[PDB]
Amino acid sequence: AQSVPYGVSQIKAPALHSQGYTGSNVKVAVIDSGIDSSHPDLKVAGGASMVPSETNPFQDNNSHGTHVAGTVAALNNSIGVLGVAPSASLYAVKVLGADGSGQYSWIINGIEWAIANNMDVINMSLGGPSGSAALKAAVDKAVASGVVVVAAAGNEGTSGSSSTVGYPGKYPSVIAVGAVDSSNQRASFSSVGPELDVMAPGVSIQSTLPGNKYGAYNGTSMASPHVAGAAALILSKHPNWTNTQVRSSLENTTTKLGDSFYYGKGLINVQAAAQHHHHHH
Amino acid sequence: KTEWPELVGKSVEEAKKVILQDKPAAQIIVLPVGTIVTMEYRIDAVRLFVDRLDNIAQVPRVG
Numbered sequence: 001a002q003s004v005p006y007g008v009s010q011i012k013a014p015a016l017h018s019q020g021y022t023g024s025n026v027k028v029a030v031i032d033s034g035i036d037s038s039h040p041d042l043k044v045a046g047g048a049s050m051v052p053s054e055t056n057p058f059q060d061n062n063s064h065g066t067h068v069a070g071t072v073a074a075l076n077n078s079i080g081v082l083g084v085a086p087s088a089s090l091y092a093v094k095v096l097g098a099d100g101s102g103q104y105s106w107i108i109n110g111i112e113w114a115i116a117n118n119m120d121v122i123n124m125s126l127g128g129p130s131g132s133a134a135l136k137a138a139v140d141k142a143v144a145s146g147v148v149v150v151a152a153a154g155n156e157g158t159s160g161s162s163s164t165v166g167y168p169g170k171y172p173s174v175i176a177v178g179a180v181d182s183s184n185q186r187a188s189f190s191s192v193g194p195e196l197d198v199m200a201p202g203v204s205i206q207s208t209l210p211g212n213k214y215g216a217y218n219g220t221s222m223a224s225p226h227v228a229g230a231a232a233l234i235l236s237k238h239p240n241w242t243n244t245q246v247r248s249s250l251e252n253t254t255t256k257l258g259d260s261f262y263y264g265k266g267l268i269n270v271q272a273a274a275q276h277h278h279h280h281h
Numbered sequence: 282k283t284e285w286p287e288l289v290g291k292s293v294e295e296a297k298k299v300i301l302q303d304k305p306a307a308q309i310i311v312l313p314v315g316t317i318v319t320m321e322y323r324i325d326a327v328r329l330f331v332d333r334l335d336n337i338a339q340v341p342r343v344g
């Protein structure tokens with residue numbers, strides 16, 4: 001039997017599924033550590049590796065990219081879990097090696113590959129404390145090109161009144177996503193700051209792991225693909241909406257939680273986002 | 282204890298030793314500072330970011 005992880009229900013993805021929208025024909029690049037394409041609960045449509053010593057993007061030697069991918073798009077069938085956008089065209093854009101790290105130029109080359117390959121959505125469950133002009137230029141170019149770009153806010157927690165959102169989430173063109181649990185409480189590790197845009201579930205998130213496994217992970221890495229997946233649902237229902245419109249639809253329909261420094265606009269609600277008229281619940 | 286700001290500017294070797302005294306079961310990974318990394322939160326892990334001289338270049342923390 002398939003299970004629906006609590007986070008997929010929490011953002012109201014099943015309302016879109018019941019309307020008949022599952023992310024079909026929407027291309028989502030998981031820019032990450034690769035995706036294990038042999039997992040029976042995933043279907044990987046293509047991809048490319050920018051990691052010079054790990055040239056197969058369909059081999060995930062870390063496990064992280066495969067978990068993220070399952071939250072985006074685990075298949076709708078009778079096994080495993082169900083992704084937010086289970087019909088999405090999933091692309092493994094491997095820019096992180098086994099140890100979970102990548103050079104800036106690797107990430108940038110993956111963002112470039114996603115633009116050149118007409119990806120509709122990028123998920124980047126990744127980050128660091130410093131930016132670069134060239135990283136900023138890559139994400140800005142992807143957005144200018146029409147791509148919805150979503151990233152983890154970071155797991156730096158709080159630091160008095162300072163922003164702790166990392167890059168690339170900290171860039172204005174990228175949607176930065178923080179993590180809540182099943183009661184909508186901010187996870188203690190979740191980064192904070194005026195750059196925090198929206199929240200999604202990122203505590204004890206069950207998803208696919210390499211070698212035909214499943215497991216519960218924690219992080220703003222787990223929150224970000226709920227939002228990438230949501231963008232794919234919205235696009236499958238409104239294939240002409242621009243990235244601009246998809247981003248505002250998600251921002252404008254959140255369930256407001258606490259102060260925006262800690263929670264941004266609140267929890268995404270993809271049911272409300274995918275209506276024509278938007279308001280917060 | 283989940284952050285070690287006093288280790289910034291120390292050798293990677295001394296950092297590992299200190300962190301393992303405070304958290305003997307820690308899963309330590311050493312990475313280059315100025316790289317981008319996955320944003321899962323692993324309560325058992327400490328990532329140490331080193332500069333090109335193998336000294337700690339970022340406050341180590343759990344995650």
Ligand SMILES: [Ca+2]
Nearest residue numbers: 075077079081
């Ligand atoms: Ca499934």
Ligand code: NA
Nearest residue numbers: 169170171174
């Ligand atoms: Na941002």
